[PDB]
């Protein structure tokens, strides 16, 4: 396999996949968010 | 004369302190604006406000 053809694979196959691979761990992420919204508000109240 | 004098005097002394407190009380209201008051929040505008 040639070098340049591989580069296309790097750009359009590897890079996307490397990105997809980094897990969100969303349950722990959602916690981060909820903590985040309480902290911006905090000492102020509610809406919006 | 002297009675009117002393009492009128006392009034002006009290005038200061009461006005200060009246101002301060309103200032307190601006410093924090509570949203957890039950009479305040219906929430989604009408259809929940009494």
Output the DSSP codes for A16-31. Answer: HHHHHHS---HHHHHH
Q: What is the resolution of this structure in A?
A: 3.7
Nearest-angstrom CA–CA distance, B44 and B50: 12
The alpha-carbon gap from B38 to the nearest alpha carbon of chain A, in Å, equals 13
For residues B32 and B39, what is the distance between their CA atoms, to the nearest angstrom? Answer: 17
Closest residue of chain A to B34, computed from CA coordinates: A45
Q: What share of chain B is helix, strand, coil (3-state, %, to 5)?
A: 60, 0, 40
Q: How far apart are CA B48 and CA B50, in angstroms?
A: 6
The DSSP secondary-structure symbol of A22 reads: S
Structure-block tokens of residue B18: 């009461």
- Give the whole-angstrom CA distance, residue B14 versus residue B21: 11
- Measured between alpha carbons, how far is A7 from A23 in angstroms, rounded to an integer? 25
């Amino acid at each position: 396999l040639s070098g340049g053809a591989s580069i296309n694979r790097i750009f359009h196959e590897r890079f996307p996949f490397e990105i997809v691979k980094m897990e969100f761990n969303e349950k722990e992420l959602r916690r981060e968010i909820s903590y985040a919204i309480k902290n911006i508000h905090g000492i102020r109240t509610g809406l919006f | 004369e002297e009675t009117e004098r002393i009492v009128a005097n006392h009034i002006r002394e009290r005038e200061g302190k009461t006005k200060d407190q009246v101002l301060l009380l309103i200032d307190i209201q601006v410093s924090y604006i509570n949203t957890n008051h039950e009479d305040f929040i219906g929430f989604a505008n009408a259809q929940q406000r009494s």
